[PDB]
Ligand binder design. Structure first.
Ligand SMILES: CS(=O)(=O)c1cc(Br)cc(NCc2cccc(CN3C[C@H](O)[C@@H](O)[C@H](O)[C@H]3CO)c2)c1
Ligand SMILES: *[C@@H]1O[C@H](CO)[C@@H](O)[C@H](O)[C@H]1NC(C)=O
Length: 765
């Protein structure tokens, strides 16, 4: 039955708009297959279209906003794009139709409406670009009856091992098509849908913009050669209309020009299924998907007071939809330094200069290929897998569709190498790389990232203990299936646990350090004078200078999160030998958090170094780091240390702003200094951890029940309202929030862990 659910999940999830790096495009969960993308831009001049054309996601003055109004990857959804530069409001509706043996069928409606500022007679170029990778696959444009292009539908017939036989149709659509009275119309026609069918080597098919522009340029060169000149030039929109040449190839460019509003459909029909998909099917299944999205949202994200209002529900639907709508399928080689240079051990003072010298040997090489199916922080800025971000992303997604979340977890752990390393940043293939400066592509097998994916696994375990509808929960509804998933993943979780303990070890034994355990102590590898990128809190202040005797309380707390998860999963699988070890490690971390990291003077947890005189020193910088044992759920609800942490959390002069918890205390010497990334702003991912732990204490007997209830109530309200007010004013989820003004700052379209807000509103943890 595990095998049966696996195949049905495969078939359900195969097709999607799984190219979140571009406004709109489709690909299946197959490395070398059929991909589509949408391009559009106004044309007012002989030179403007190169500057107006849209393809890859951006955010700037020219784009008001964009995102998914509703989305669920098994069914499809609706995207809204508000383009000021091109004066267009665009809708892309995408729907999946199950059937046959090859992942089913799908359809898209593209609709563009001029805004009130646009010229009513605006000419808009729209391109549908289709590519297919594979040695033994075929794709052919059926030629038109008409001389110069198509009056009706463009039909593509293709075949592959992976998709079987299929037909991809771009409909005639509705809208005025401009007609040229120019002499050129005798050879190029007066204006119509055109198709160019081309072949390039498989590895460059993703470069749609340059491929398109090379064809436009060859057309303009043809005009120059054949005496079309500035004495009497064709109109711009005819100069940029490709000569019709349909045929077979691994690239097909479908170009339409519209005057005023337009719409057209894309119908992908799987031959292995029944009747071919129609525009009538598309309209019906779009209406059905909305109805089903609506009913699941009310069940899963039942917003509690005081966020019951319709405004909050629309806000919640927008944040959730953009998070799950960012799901991508990536395929290609990663760039990895596999030298394991001894400088990467960082055992000496000044280790950052040694490691810089090693990096400057440039022994990094492409390896793979790998695939990844994952949500992303940001379409315009970070359209790729980040390891600790994905733990936050999957908390709401698992509520929606636990089988989807387990698919993404499996996809991530299938990247783990023999030693137990997953790269914190997955840049798979040339397309993924095109967005990342070379200096920043190379992954390092000594760089960790917080194991936040274990949190998702903890939610799954608690749910396990206590057709698209049925599939979404198969892995909890059928315990045999749930357990088999954990049996197969369990060794990889354990391998990662051992990797952390082996590669991120701190030094107790070699200094004057007293503690309950000689073993449990941790130091993030990879830190520079001003940074610790691997912790996730890039520029949160750490001991100066960095030093091989450093110990990091967040890293120890993360290892606690992992042991506790392995106790749970180990127990379920009857791995008795394993569970007794985990139990002794947990006990050791509990004691060593106090013996190495607790400051009585300051009343919080601290990172540690060793002095100029080789002695253990605490270095206290009050902020997220100070609370880590509490954020990760390691403290007993009666702990005196908890009470001191609750006082710190609640203190307005330290962490507590009207807009949420500050990353760093106003009292710290490093408040608002340097890049001020994690040195004052409010981050929703760490606020979400605080909110969940306060709620845990508020719904249990103990000395802090009422303190925790008050802080829970207020922090939930402060966080939700800051994210909502900013969404209402800007249309955006932001990366972080200003604790003086409450303004969203840094990166827009951060959905992204800012979307946890939908879990905070729905409550009941
Ligand atoms: C002056 S700056 O404000 O542009 C600035 C200051 C400092 Br210092 C460092 C950086 N790095 C750039 C950078 C690269 C890749 C992803 C991110 C986004 N975040 C950063 C999160 O910290 C990380 O936890 C999270 O996984 C990651 C993904 O969501 C950012 C930028
Ligand atoms: C889905 O089935 C195909 C069959 O060719 C298989 O090779 C592929 O790995 C499966 N997809 C996954 C594991 O998501």
């Amino acid at each position: 039955l595990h095998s049966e659910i696996g195949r049905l999940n495969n078939q359900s999830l195969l097709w999607g708009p799984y190219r979140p790096n571009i406004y709109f495009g489709t690909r299946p969960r197959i490395g070398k297959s059929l991909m589509t993308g949408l391009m559009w831009g106004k044309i007012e001049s002989y030179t403007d279209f190169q500057h107006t054309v849209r393809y890859t996601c951006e955010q700037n003055e020219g784009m008001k906003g964009y995102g998914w109004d509703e989305y669920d990857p098994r069914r499809g959804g609706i995207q809204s794009i508000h383009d000021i530069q091109n004066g267009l409001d665009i809708t892309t509706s995408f729907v999946k139709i199950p059937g046959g043996a090859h992942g089913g069928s799908w359809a898209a409606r593209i609709k563009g409406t001029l805004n009130d500022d646009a010229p009513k007679d605006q000419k808009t170029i729209v391109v549908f670009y289709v590519s297919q990778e594979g040695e033994n696959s075929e794709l052919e444009a059926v030629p038109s009856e008409n001389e110069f292009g198509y009056e009706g539908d463009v039909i593509l017939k293709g075949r592959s091992e992976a998709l079987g036989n299929y037909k991809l149709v771009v409909t005639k659509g509705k809208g005025v098509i401009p007609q040229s009275d120019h002499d050129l119309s005798r050879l190029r026609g007066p204006g119509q849908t055109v198709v160019q069918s081309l072949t390039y080597p498989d590895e460059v098919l993703w470069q749609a913009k340059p491929i398109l522009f090379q064809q436009l340029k060859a057309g303009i060169d043809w005009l120059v050669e054949n005496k079309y000149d500035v004495a009497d030039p064709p109109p711009p929109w005819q100069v940029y209309l490709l000569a019709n040449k349909p045929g077979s190839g691994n690239v097909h460019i479908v170009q339409k020009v519209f005057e005023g509003d337009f719409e057209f459909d894309i119908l992908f029909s799987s031959e292995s299924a029944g009747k071919e998909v129609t525009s009538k099917d598309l309209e019906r299944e779009v209406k059905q998907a909305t109805e089903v999205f609506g009913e699941r949202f009310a069940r899963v994200f039942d917003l509690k007071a005081p966020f019951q209002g319709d405004n909050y529900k629309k806000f919640g639907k927008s944040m959730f939809s953009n998070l799950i709508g960012g799901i991508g399928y990536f395929y290609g080689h990663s760039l990895v330094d596999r030298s394991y240079a001894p400088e990467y051990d960082e055992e000496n003072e000044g280790f950052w200069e040694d490691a810089a010298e090693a990096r400057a040997r440039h022994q990094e090489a492409l390896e793979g290929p790998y695939e990844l199916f994952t949500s992303i922080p940001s379409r315009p800025f970070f359209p790729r897998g980040f390891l600790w971000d994905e733990g936050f992303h999957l908390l709401p997604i698992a509520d929606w569709d636990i089988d989807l979340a387990l698919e993404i977890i499996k996809s991530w752990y299938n990247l783990m190498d023999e030693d137990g390393w997953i790269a914190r940043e997955q840049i798979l293939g040339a397309e993924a790389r095109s967005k990342v400066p070379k200096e920043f592509q190379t992954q390092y097998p000594h760089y960790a990232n917080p194991p936040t994916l274990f949190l998702v696994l903890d939610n799954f375990v608690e749910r396990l203990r206590k057709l698209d509808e049925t599939l979404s929960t198969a892995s909890v509804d059928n315990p045999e299936v749930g357990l088999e998933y954990l049996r197969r993943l369990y060794p990889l979780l354990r391998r990662q646990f051992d990797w952390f303990r082996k590669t991120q070890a701190g030094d107790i034994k070699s200094y004057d350090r007293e503690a309950y355990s000689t073993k449990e102590a941790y130091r993030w590898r990879g830190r520079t004078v001003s940074h610790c990128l691997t912790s996730g809190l890039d520029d949160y202040p750490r001991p100066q200078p960095p030093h091989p005797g450093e110990l990091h309380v967040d890293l120890m707390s993360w290892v606690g999160v992992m042991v506790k998860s392995l106790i749970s999963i180990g127990s379920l699988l009857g791995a008795t030998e394993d569970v007794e070890f985990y139990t002794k490690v947990l006990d050791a971390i509990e004691h060593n958090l106090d013996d190495l990291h607790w400051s009585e003077k300051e009343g919080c947890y601290c990172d540690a170094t060793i002095d100029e005189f080789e002695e253990h020193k605490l270095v206290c910088h009050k902020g997220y780091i100070s609370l880590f044992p509490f954020l990760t759920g390691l403290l007993k609800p009666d702990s005196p240390k908890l009470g001191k942490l609750l006082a710190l959390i609640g203190d307005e002069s330290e962490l507590w702003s009207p807009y949420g918890l500050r990353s760093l205390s106003k009292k710290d010497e490093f408040y608002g200094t340097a890049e001020n990334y994690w040195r004052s702003p409010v981050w929703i991912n760490i606020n979400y951890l605080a909110i969940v732990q306060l709620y845990n204490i508020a719904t249990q007997d103990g000395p802090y029940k009422e303190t925790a209830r008050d802080l829970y109530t207020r922090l939930r309200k402060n966080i939700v309202e800051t994210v909502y007010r900013n969404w209402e004013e800007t249309g955006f989820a932001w990366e972080q929030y200003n604790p003086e003004t409450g303004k969203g700052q840094r990166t827009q379209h951060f959905t992204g862990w800012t979307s946890l807000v939908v879990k905070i509103m729905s409550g009941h943890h």
